[PDB]
Design a protein around this ligand. Structure first.
Ligand SMILES: [Mg+2]
Ligand SMILES: [Mg+2]
Ligand SMILES: [Mg+2]
Lengths: 209, 209
């Protein structure tokens, strides 16, 4: 009985990492086998290049960095497929959607070109999108020193996310991330239990194909 | 007056590196400004990962390595466009065509998926394909320890190259690489002079778009 592939995506300071951690904890306490993954995965050779770029410690050509972000997901595909086949549900903090939305926010990057490298990746059974006013996310700390952490760029990434949500091949679920940490968690937990049950009776799909 | 972008592609031990070096030397002796480039460019962070993979010192997931090969070309695009705009002709030993043909030789890799990462790169004004029987290439040394250096795989890459040659958007020129080093060089030199003159009156194009 395969595990479910659950991805959390969302607006800045929307709570993806907090909710991903809480979801895995709750699923395991309820007897499921579930594990947390995140992208970028900064531990690999590619992940270190990506981490240096995001910290502004290095500059990387825009197309090259886009392809490194995608390669960073492909290097984990053998692990992802093994875990799912063993019945482990995977909760993933960011995935290909962030890859497309962040590069697609730059000038002269079509959504089509941005999607291609990730075509064929394991298809999530559930994609949660944590919605929050780009401004309520402001009440939640302040813009940092990391790349892409400015309002005008976040707004362009958000528009790209809305274009990706029109894709009916994917099980997109909107989450109201303006609520308390525990209320948002309960909303995500119930959607997740349903996906683990139901969404899993079919074979793991391929993204964007 | 921009420089020309000339790529050399070809069958194993076809003579790409020898002819690329000789071409730059001849063009410069004839008063042109010309410089040599090669892919993979093993000097960058990405190039070192690629070199380790090719030497079998490391294993890399097939989709990830394909994207690293493409990223390795994109990281050089700012240099390529600057040189061409300054009137320097660039002679390139392997380019996106090798990228598509070598990954496309593997199972379950469509030519379409393989092309996408390189869509948009500077379009060569001339693509030379050095033809040689996969066997006459045998009389030229023996298969080494590097990856992809076996006959059955080279044969599948060659089939992919022939599919890419059907693309009429590109100025493909076949070269009979079975001749002597000097005869092959003279054939390549004359085609190159014509491209530098003529092919350059139009703006630099975009590959596969
Ligand atoms: Mg986070
Ligand atoms: Mg397409
Ligand atoms: Mg060579």
């Amino acid at each position: 009985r395969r595990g479910a592939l659950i991805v959390l995506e969302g607006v800045d300071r929307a709570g993806k990492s907090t909710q991903s951690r809480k979801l895995v904890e709750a699923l395991c306490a309820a007897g499921h086998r579930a594990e947390l993954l995140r992208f970028p995965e900064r531990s690999t050779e590619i992940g270190k290049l990506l981490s240096s770029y995001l910290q502004k410690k290095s500059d990387v050509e825009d197309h090259s960095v886009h392809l490194l972000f995608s390669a960073n997901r492909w290097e984990q595909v053998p692990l992802i497929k093994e875990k799912l086949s063993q019945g482990v549900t995977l909760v993933v903090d960011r995935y290909a959607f962030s890859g497309v939305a962040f590069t697609g926010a730059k000038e002269n990057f079509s959504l089509d070109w941005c999607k291609q490298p990730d075509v064929g990746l394991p298809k999530p059974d559930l994609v949660l999108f944590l919605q929050l006013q780009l401004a309520d996310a402001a009440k939640r700390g302040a813009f940092g020193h990391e790349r892409y952490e400015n309002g005008a760029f976040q707004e362009r990434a958000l528009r790209c996310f809305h274009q990706l949500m029109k894709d009916t091949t994917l099980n997109w679920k909107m989450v109201d991330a303006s609520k308390s940490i525990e209320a948002v968690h309960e909303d995500i937990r119930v959607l997740s239990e349903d996906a683990i049950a139901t969404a899993t009776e079919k074979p793991l799909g391929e993204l964007w194909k």
